[PDB]
């Protein structure tokens, strides 16, 4: 049975909302105004530039919690026009228009021009008599050359056109259709996005079932989805992150190098300090150390109890680690094994997820007799938070929130939540609990996580991690695709396991993966059955790790400004080429390269021989430290050794490097090394050096006109320099001194105003 | 339950084939050499550069007809059985099994791996729920490796990330399913199973192409390149070469539309309207309602609408047109012939003896059982009778919804007949045409196809809609069907469903007349140009004249399609396989070796297109553009991006009214960006597709030497964008807007400058 | 799923027989003349004063022996009238008329006056997807004061109006709906009878399902029934 809206029967304005009653048949005559279904479509606007559509059949159905944490406004200024030919609701430049009369049609328009919509008989209500279940479905059009992105952390081809996607968290890995972080939101290169507002399973056919349409369907009697205007993908992500939650600003130290104890290796304080001292003796900067599962006794994860026979003095170990200037992370998850002595206590208190019959839900995956913490029970939440606070008190700084995706549905939650929606919303509840604990103990500014699962709104709790990848170039590319997709799904910060997780990597794979990981927002050395310390592979591996850790620390003024941008506008640090250059037709299908912020284009090397092909958009691009220049709007082929890769800065750029290559959290406005790239005649470029809190502490402007570059500074800075790159010699400089360098002329300023001739 | 090969137990050489017995467990010790399955992998080579792999579990299963028409050969192979590995080599392609503890399957080109099956990535599955058994394989995909083909699919051109099912315009389904795919790494794969093959292309396992089939064995062929074109060449040699359609078929076709009212008067009205408006027309097609409604396909003309069929056809032929009529392999119950067919047993029966019937497309529809030889002869007799009245070719529609709960006359396996029926049906019609009009004059307009059906051109896109989205879908489908072994492809100009806006119709005319085969056909609205606008007539005239003028080049490209299986409408990846910018290009294509066409998909005329390496020149605007980059342009209804690559010697003709004329008389040669020290060749084809005249142009400093070989007369050469020259020896010169025109007085000229 | 004749598409005269091709939807326009079932109603006369109606869906079904021993003649003098408004087949005083145009209607007439018939959407083809079975059913009207008799040796009330009857021999007795002698032929006090020509189980709802109609249904792809004129019940039996 298929029931579809075919004609508008009535349109009513209820305040700032517009209700359309539509019938599946002609109902212009009274004889046809009975014995027929009637769809009720509510059009509203929870935020300027966002239009929500609620298509309902039966309102008597149950609509139980949880619901996505959306910042829904009920007083947004809209304009509603109910004419004889159509009815239109306008929020800012976006509008929704229902065509009255014989031909039903729903259109989403930008300033009057159609950007998408549902054609006649492309949405409605379906009754599967086989399974005896009811669904509501919609089909939004795809224009010529229109590409779709996002839909969570998916590792399939970056462009979604032609794919079936299902918003159902599952533990597959990095090489499968399954995903740990499913978000029913997609984005388009035409500058609009769509959010299907259903925590339960949403089924997307992206150009697969109907090749010219994105179809999405859900179970039940109503379908709610929001169309979010741009007009650019960046603006779309901005509106979406304002609507569902802004990414938090991670602490500066979190952007350093992380080292883990690996998974199934033997570790104690002696081994941890042995590796840390090996890092120090090899002059390898380390900033965060992570204790993985076996910091608790096996089969007892996660009971929060230190193994006495392996860590007899945990607090003293942590203080000595912190005395070394390091930060501490530990592994946790929302499950507990039956072996733990705490399991009986939790069972008696009723803090574990129960089946409808009262028995506990358990399975033998990951842990014997595994049970789930019921976070719908407030007392279980307080117990978990008490354990978390106790660990933070002994010196732990952050947490790795692993797992939280295979949530069963044949259960009854303490608060009565709908299991079908809890399956996904549990990741949010769990990560939010841990994040609130961190806010209460270390402080909101110092709060950071390492999370493997996520739901709509979980971007507010960075950072997020790719998962169980393999040690080869193909899986490296898969990880990059997943990171780009999650960036375009509302998450600003993303990490991945350098060198892979399963199996030991060949030396060259490890070196290339190090280069790629240290040019990401967050970089961690972690493995499953093999160490990830550099010297376990080669001496050149140590050199590569040192080189790129030093590089990342020198770039921190720029990277932390980009992180501030991610917090303020929802712009991911790891941007897909389409995201930065949405008007360039050559960037639609680019997944082997990315933009690290506004100004840096990175193209990791996926070849043992060092071969790499990459596309440069329009302009004159300059390598960050090799300094070679290349023309833009074309592809380039190169070969690089283990210490190099394509890292090119766009023209008309004023980039801020730092003078510290040992730690990421330092006074970036002291000794700042400014770098000027291809400042054209009549153009001006700006550089904002961030403070610790993410705000701008110093702003430097450079305007070129003919042969005069005027540089003006505003704010607080000291001892900064500016490198006219690929300019060997100048005709003088007033306001500072000049010197030569391999990279160009270095001017040392003595004030916030200099004027360069030539 | 899952059973997978994990270790090599034995390798035996049986003649020119290599059999590997592999175990799903450790079997180096006798105690473990029992109570275990044993996979048998036969590696062989039916053709140089092609390696077939047959992985089987139980040989006691039934393996009944039909099978794909493969040209299986004494091919030179080299077998090497060492202590570390076993390798079978055909030409540059080789398959290597790693012995010892680590099982591994690798395909190598000159020793370098191009793909393969890793440990625990293939094997045998027993679903006890459905009680069915399947065999599956997973071939690796490298970084940046893209997949194309698998038939005429209207999804994204690159298959990476798609579910495909080999089971016959705006949906995942397909009219022409081919279990063969191609890669930008210069190899292809053919899964040798006519029944349903399930492909997960980067969908289930994102870094692998997985293919599975039901039964106890899986047979697939890896075909080397090293270029995609070479892959298509070997594949078309293996499964069938595209036939060379007659020249007249490359003209403009016009249909009566589907459910519109037409009679002899309407046919004459369309013909006379085309003629008075100076619109050349070359083929006329009669659609379904040339037979009485509800009686398709009984081959009986409708008397109240076509009272005099043979005489009308005779007059149409006197005006120089060719005639096509609609047919399909079904018959309606209303027909008086239905009783004859049932009593004679020519219709497909259910196992119980009753006829198979349903009420879709026709009331009480029945299927002609083409496994019955006498039914085939009856069908062919009707087709020949239609040819006797003057019909020249046939439109073989339908042939896809073949039931499986049936019993065929010859005992064929229904699951495989579901797809092979298209081949059988098209082959009968093709044999009829060869026996009546002649092999050279054989042409079809077919909507269904199976492996090997490329031998029966032409093939038609199907039921598209009248908007730019469906136009782009059609282009994608044509590119895919080209990369799946078919050299010639058409589509309904203006769309099929709903009436097109004028601009959509004009852009679609531009696109269709720059295709191998161009037809104006619709469902509920006429497709004559003046049914939209008068400027629509202008567009149709302009581009029909253009195509007739380009036929000297287009028919040479069609001969190339027949000889090497290279489609006339090439995807950018096929022509520029080494260019990273062409991997995902579906809105533009190469019409042959030298011409790049970018249809316009915008009402405003805006179009963005990518140009590969070189200096490109528009075919009639003559403006030049640098290559290796994207370009933005705006064109009116009479124009679109049509650019010729550098170092090109293109042959246009002197006739713009018909496509089938003596192209070697009055030939207009066009020289495009001939660099210093470069040489270019141009082969003008004869009517039979062979080269009748060859013209070479060599540039040396400022002297261009041009030499001709064969039979030609009165031909000229246009130095494009060269306003004046310093001299010409052997012929005369004249000026033109497009460049210097040299009229030759022999087959040897020497141009100074 | 129920498919019923609603409009006449075509009427063809095959000798002394009249074939009506009727569609379950509007087919006045070419765009809708495909992707539809088509009922084939053959009207014939095997004997003066008797009109046979064969309502069919699929001809490909098996129609195996046995069949009733009917004295069917092929050369009975009939008159066929194919107009723009209706089609009529006349044997003696009896005639059958299908109304062409927009709305289908079937009438049986004695010298031009209606004695019974099938109104719009009162016959057709039924597909039970649960049992996977196909049926053909018909409903002939009952006039005011019209009573039904016969249907074999049944021990229920003499007048059948309001009774369910099934033509299936059973060893029940004299106190049950079952019958030793089942005959799918019924008679009316208006001087006509009806014989459903199916040796297998025939299901009669005599004024039970549709109180103003005699409904008879059979399994399969065709339903054949004969209307027998009188003008008296004795003449009907003769």
CA distance A549 to A552: 5
- Dihedral of CA A454/A457/A458/A463: which sign? positive
Smallest Cα–Cα separation from A191: which of A238, A138, A122?
A238
CA distance B698 to B647: 10
CA distance B697 to B700: 10
Contacts of B among chains (3+ CB pairs under 8 A): A, C
Which residues neighbour A181 within 8 Å (Cβ) at sequence distance 6 or greater? A152, A153, A169, A427, A452, A453, A454, A455, A458, A464, A486, A489, A491
List, edge to edge, every strand of the sheet that includes C185-188. C7-14, C17-23, C39-47, C50-56, C222-228, C193-196, C185-188, C148-150
Resolution (angstroms) stands at 2.7
SS3 B671: strand
SS3 B385: helix
Alpha carbon of A652 to those of A672, A707, B44: distances in Å? 19, 15, 60
Helix orientation angle between B228-239 and B534-564, rounded to the nearest 10 degrees = 80
Which residues neighbour A425 within 8 Å (Cβ) at sequence distance 6 or greater? A66, A68, A199, A417, A455
Question: How far out from the chain centre does Cα B720 lie?
Answer: 33
* Closest by Cβ to B354, choosing from C36, C57, C61: C61
**Residues of chain B neighbouring C61 (CB-CB closer than 8 A):** 354-355
SS3 B552: helix
Interchain contact, B203 vs A161, CB within 8 Å: no
Upstream peptide bond of B458 is cis (omega within 30 degrees of 0): yes
User: What's the residue count for chain C?
Assistant: 238
Interchain contact, C62 vs B354, CB within 8 Å: yes
Alpha carbon of C120 to those of C28, C99, C103, C124, C140: distances in Å? 18, 10, 7, 10, 11
Read off the DSSP letter of residue A315. H
The tokens 């200037």 sit on which residue?
A: A325
SS3 B145: coil
CA distance A44 to A55: 12
Structure tokens at B540: 């149709």
Smallest Cα–Cα separation from A390: which of A491, A283, A498, A314?
A314
Read off the DSSP letter of residue A651. S
Structure tokens at A551: 């590089």
CA distance B531 to A732: 73
CA distance B70 to B487: 18
Q: Which of A153, A205, A221, A402 is catalytic?
A: A402
User: A677 and A622 in contact (C-beta within 8 Å)?
Assistant: yes
3-class SS string, chain C: CEECCCEEEEEEEECCEEEEEEECCCCCCHHHCCCCCCEEEEEEEEECCEEEEEEECCCCCCCCCCCCCCCCCCCCCCEEEECCCEEEEEECCEEEEEECCCCCCEEEEECCEEEEEECCCCCEEEEECCCCEEEEEEEEECCCCCCEEECCCCCCCCCCCCEEEECCCCCCCCCCCCCCCCCCEEEECCCCEEEECCCCCCEEEECCCCCCEEEEEEECCEEEEEEECCCCHHHHHC
CA distance B652 to B59: 59
**Residues of chain A neighbouring B627 (CB-CB closer than 8 A):** none
User: C25 and C6 in contact (C-beta within 8 Å)?
Assistant: yes
CA distance A289 to A584: 42
SS3 B505: helix
**Residues of chain B neighbouring C33 (CB-CB closer than 8 A):** 259, 293-294
Smallest Cα–Cα separation from A459: which of A557, A573, A350?
A573
Interchain contact, C33 vs B356, CB within 8 Å: no
Q: Which of A205, A397, A468, A478 is catalytic?
A: A468
- Dihedral of CA A517/A520/A525/A526: which sign? negative
**Residues of chain B neighbouring A162 (CB-CB closer than 8 A):** 155-156, 159, 161-162
Chain breaks of chain A after residues with C–N above 2.5 Å: none
CA distance C235 to C238: 5
SS3 B240: coil
Which residues neighbour B524 within 8 Å (Cβ) at sequence distance 6 or greater? B257, B258, B259, B260, B497, B498, B499, C31
Smallest Cα–Cα separation from A593: which of A481, A504, A671?
A481
Interchain contact, B261 vs C38, CB within 8 Å: no
Minimum Cα–Cα distance from B349: chain C residue: C60
Smallest Cα–Cα separation from A182: which of A463, A496, A401, A428?
A428
Helix orientation angle between B468-482 and B502-513, rounded to the nearest 10 degrees = 20
Smallest Cα–Cα separation from B186: which of B87, B97, B113, B237?
B113
Structure tokens at A55: 């298509």
User: Is A292 one of the catalytic residues?
Assistant: no
CA distance B344 to B322: 34
Which residues neighbour A212 within 8 Å (Cβ) at sequence distance 6 or greater? A141, A142, B170, B469, B470, B473
∠ CA A140-A142-A147, nearest 5°, is 125
Q: Which residues of A447-465 are buried (b: 16+ CB within 10 A; e: fewer)?
A: bbbbbbbbbbbbbbbbbbb
DSSP secondary structure letters along A435-504:
HHHHHHHT-STT--EEES-B-TTGGGS--EE--S-BSSHHHHHHHHHHHHHHHTTT---EEEEET-SBSP
Question: How far out from the chain centre does Cα A657 lie?
Answer: 25
Task: State whether residue B583 sits within 8 Å of chain A by CB.
Answer: yes
* Closest by Cβ to C60, choosing from B288, B355, B361: B355
- Dihedral of CA B424/B426/B429/B430: which sign? negative
CA distance B520 to B542: 15
Contacts made by residues C60-64, CB under 8 angstroms, sequence distance 24+ = C60/B342, C60/B347, C60/B354, C60/B355, C60/B356, C60/B357, C60/B364, C60/B366, C60/C221, C61/B354, C61/B355, C61/C220, C61/C221, C61/C222, C62/B352, C62/B353, C62/B354, C63/C222
User: A567 and A302 in contact (C-beta within 8 Å)?
Assistant: no
CA distance B239 to A227: 49
Separation of first and last alpha carbons in chain A: 76
Which residues neighbour B575 within 8 Å (Cβ) at sequence distance 6 or greater? B582, B590, B593, B612
Interchain contact, B338 vs C59, CB within 8 Å: yes
Task: State whether residue A578 sits within 8 Å of chain B by CB.
Answer: no
CA distance C73 to C52: 11
Min Cα distance B67 → chain A (Å) is: 30
- B675 half-sphere exposure, CB direction, 13 A CA radius: 8
Minimum Cα–Cα distance from A631: chain B residue: B629
User: B43 and B18 in contact (C-beta within 8 Å)?
Assistant: yes
Interchain contact, B364 vs C57, CB within 8 Å: yes
CATH of the domain at A523: 3.20.20.80
CA distance A529 to A262: 7
Min Cα distance B626 → chain A (Å) is: 12
CA distance B101 to A739: 63
Read off the DSSP letter of residue A35. S
User: What's the residue count for chain A?
Assistant: 758
Upstream peptide bond of A155 is cis (omega within 30 degrees of 0): no
CA distance B627 to B672: 14
User: B361 and B400 in contact (C-beta within 8 Å)?
Assistant: no
User: A375 and A430 in contact (C-beta within 8 Å)?
Assistant: yes
Residues of chain A numbered 198-257 and touching chain B (CB < 8 Å): 207-213
Which residues neighbour A505 within 8 Å (Cβ) at sequence distance 6 or greater? A471, A472, A499, A513, A537
- Residues of B with a known catalytic role: 397, 400, 463
Burial class (CB in 10 A: 0-12, 13-18, 19+), A653: buried
Smallest Cα–Cα separation from B429: which of B179, B243, B641?
B243
Task: State whether residue B170 sits within 8 Å of chain A by CB.
Answer: yes
Smallest Cα–Cα separation from B586: which of B134, B158, B82?
B158
Contacts of A among chains (3+ CB pairs under 8 A): B
CA distance A407 to A418: 12
Task: State whether residue B584 sits within 8 Å of chain A by CB.
Answer: yes
Helix or strand run (H / E) with residue A517: helix A507-518
CA distance A48 to B346: 68
CA distance B520 to A535: 70
Structure tokens at B50: 């092609």
The tokens 């540089």 sit on which residue?
A: A711
SS3 A124: strand
CA distance B530 to A380: 76
CA distance A675 to A687: 10
Q: Which of B302, B338, B364 to mutate to test the interface with C (most CBs of C within 10 A)?
A: B364
Residues of chain B numbered 590-619 and touching chain A (CB < 8 Å): 601-602, 608, 610
Can you give the residue range of the structural domain that contains B495?
A: 247-569
Alpha carbon of C43 to those of C14, C98, C219: distances in Å? 10, 10, 21
CA distance A655 to A128: 59
Interchain contact, B360 vs C61, CB within 8 Å: no
Q: Which of B292, B363, B524 to mutate to test the interface with C (most CBs of C within 10 A)?
A: B363
The pairing of strands B132-140 and A148-150 is unpaired
CA distance B477 to A344: 62
Q: Which of B153, B207, B576 to mutate to test the interface with A (most CBs of A within 10 A)?
A: B207
CA distance A236 to A246: 13
User: A492 and A563 in contact (C-beta within 8 Å)?
Assistant: yes
For residue C178, which phi and psi values (nearest 5 degrees)?
Answer: -65, 160
Interchain contact, C62 vs B364, CB within 8 Å: no
Burial class (CB in 10 A: 0-12, 13-18, 19+), B437: middle
Which residues neighbour A131 within 8 Å (Cβ) at sequence distance 6 or greater? none
User: Is A568 one of the catalytic residues?
Assistant: no
DSSP-H helix ranges across B515-641: 534-564, 572-575
**Residues of chain B neighbouring C62 (CB-CB closer than 8 A):** 352-354
Which residues neighbour B438 within 8 Å (Cβ) at sequence distance 6 or greater? none
Task: State whether residue C33 sits within 8 Å of chain B by CB.
Answer: yes
For residue A574, which phi and psi values (nearest 5 degrees)?
Answer: -95, 90
Smallest Cα–Cα separation from A693: which of A249, A327, A246?
A249
User: B250 and B659 in contact (C-beta within 8 Å)?
Assistant: yes
Upstream peptide bond of C20 is cis (omega within 30 degrees of 0): no
- Dihedral of CA B505/B508/B514/B519: which sign? negative
Interchain contact, A635 vs B580, CB within 8 Å: yes
CA distance B104 to B97: 6
- C30 half-sphere exposure, CB direction, 13 A CA radius: 16
* Closest by Cβ to A164, choosing from B159, B163, B587: B163
Min Cα distance C21 → chain B (Å) is: 8
Helix and strand numbers (H, E) in chain A are 10, 47
């Amino acid at each position: 049975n298929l029931i579809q809206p075919v004609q508008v029967y009535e349109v009513e304005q209820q305040g700032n909302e517009m209700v359309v009653y539509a019938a599946p048949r002609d109902v212009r005559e009274r004889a046809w105004q009975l014995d027929t279904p009637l769809f009720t479509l509510r059009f509203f606007s929870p935020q300027e530039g966002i239009i929500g559509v609620r298509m309902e059949h039966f309102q008597g159905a149950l609509d139980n919690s949880p619901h996505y944490p959306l910042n829904v406004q009920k007083d947004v200024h809209v304009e509603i026009e109910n004419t004889a030919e159509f009815a239109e609701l306008k929020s800012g430049s976006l509008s929704v228009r229902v065509t009255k009369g014989e031909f039903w049609a729903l259109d989403f328009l930008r300033d009057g021009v159609r950007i998408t919509g549902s054609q006649l008989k492309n949405n409605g209500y379906v009754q599967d008599s086989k399974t005896q279940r009811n669904y509501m479905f919609e089909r939004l059009d795809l224009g010529v050359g229109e590409t779709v992105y996002g839909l969570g952390e998916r590792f399939t081809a970056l462009v979604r056109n032609g794919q079936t996607v299902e918003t159902w968290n599952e533990d597959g890995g990095t090489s499968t259709e399954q995903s740990y972080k499913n978000i029913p939101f997609y984005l388009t290169n035409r500058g609009y996005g769509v959010l299907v507002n259903h925590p339960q399973r949403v089924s997307f056919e992206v150009g697969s079932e109907k090749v010219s349409k994105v179809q999405f369907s859900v179970e039940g009697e109503y379908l709610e989805y929001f169309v979010i205007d741009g007009p650019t993908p960046k603006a779309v992500l901005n509106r979406y992150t304002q609507f569902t939650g802004r990414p938090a600003l991670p602490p500066a130290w979190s952007f350093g190098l992380w080292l883990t104890t690996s998974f199934t290796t033997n570790y104690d304080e002696a081994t941890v300090n042995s590796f840390i001292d090996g890092m120090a003796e090899r002059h390898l900067p380390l900033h965060v150390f992570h204790f993985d599962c076996f910091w608790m006794k096996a089969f007892q994860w996660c009971d929060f109890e230190w193994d006495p026979l392996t860590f007899p003095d945990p607090e003293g170990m942590i203080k000595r680690l912190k005395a070394k200037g390091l930060k501490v992370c530990v592994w946790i998850n929302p499950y507990i094994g039956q072996r733990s002595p705490v399991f009986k206590e939790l069972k008696e208190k009723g803090y574990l997820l129960k089946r409808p019959d009262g028995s506990l839900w358990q399975w033998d995956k990951w842990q014997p007799g595994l049970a789930i913490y019921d976070f719908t029970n407030p007392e279980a939440c307080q117990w978990y938070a008490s354990k978390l606070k106790g660990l933070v008190a002994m010196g732990v700084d952050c947490f790795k929130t692993d797992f939280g995706e295979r949530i069963p549905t044949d259960v009854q939650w303490f608060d009565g939540s709908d299991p079908q929606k809890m399956h996904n919303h549990y990741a949010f509840i769990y990560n939010e609990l841990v994040w609130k604990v961190l806010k209460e103990t270390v402080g909101e500014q110092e709060a950071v996580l390492f999370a493997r699962s996520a739901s709509v709104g979980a971007q507010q709790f960075p950072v997020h991690w790719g998962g169980d990848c393999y040690a080869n170039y193909e899986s490296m590319a898969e990880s990059l695709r997943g990171g780009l997709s999650i960036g375009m799904s509302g998450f600003g910060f993303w990490s991945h396991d350098i060198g892979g997780f399963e199996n030991t990597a060949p030396a060259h794979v490890y070196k290339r993966w190090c280069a790629f990981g240290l040019l990401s927002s967050h970089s961690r050395l972690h493995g499953s059955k093999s160490y990830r310390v550099p010297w376990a592979y080669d001496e050149e591996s140590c050199d590569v790790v040192r080189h790129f850790t030093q590089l990342k620390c020198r770039m921190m003024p720029y990277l932390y400004r980009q992180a501030a941008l991610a917090n303020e506008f929802g712009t991911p640090m790891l941007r897909a080429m389409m995201l930065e250059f949405p008007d360039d037709p050559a960037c639609d299908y680019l997944d082997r390269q990315y933009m690290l912020g506004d100004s840096v284009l990175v193209a990791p090397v996926f070849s043992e021989a060092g071969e790499v092909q990459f596309y440069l958009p329009e302009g004159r691009w300059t390598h960050l430290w090799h300094n070679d220049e290349l023309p833009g709007s074309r592809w380039h082929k190169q070969r690089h050794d283990a210490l190099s890769l394509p890292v090119y800065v766009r023209d008309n750029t004023l980039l801020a490097l730092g003078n510290n290559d040992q730690k990421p959290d330092y006074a970036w406005h002291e000794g700042t090394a400014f770098q000027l790239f291809q400042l054209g005649d009549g153009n001006e470029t700006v550089c904002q050096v961030p403070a610790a809190d993410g705000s701008a502490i110093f702003t430097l402007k450079a305007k070129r006109q003919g042969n005069t570059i005027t540089v003006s500074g505003e704010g607080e800075a000291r001892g900064w320099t500016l490198c006219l790159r690929n300019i060997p010699q100048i005709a003088g400089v007033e306001g500072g001194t000049q010197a030569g360098s391999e990279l160009g002329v270095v001017v040392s300023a003595q004030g916030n105003a200099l004027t360069i001739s030539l």
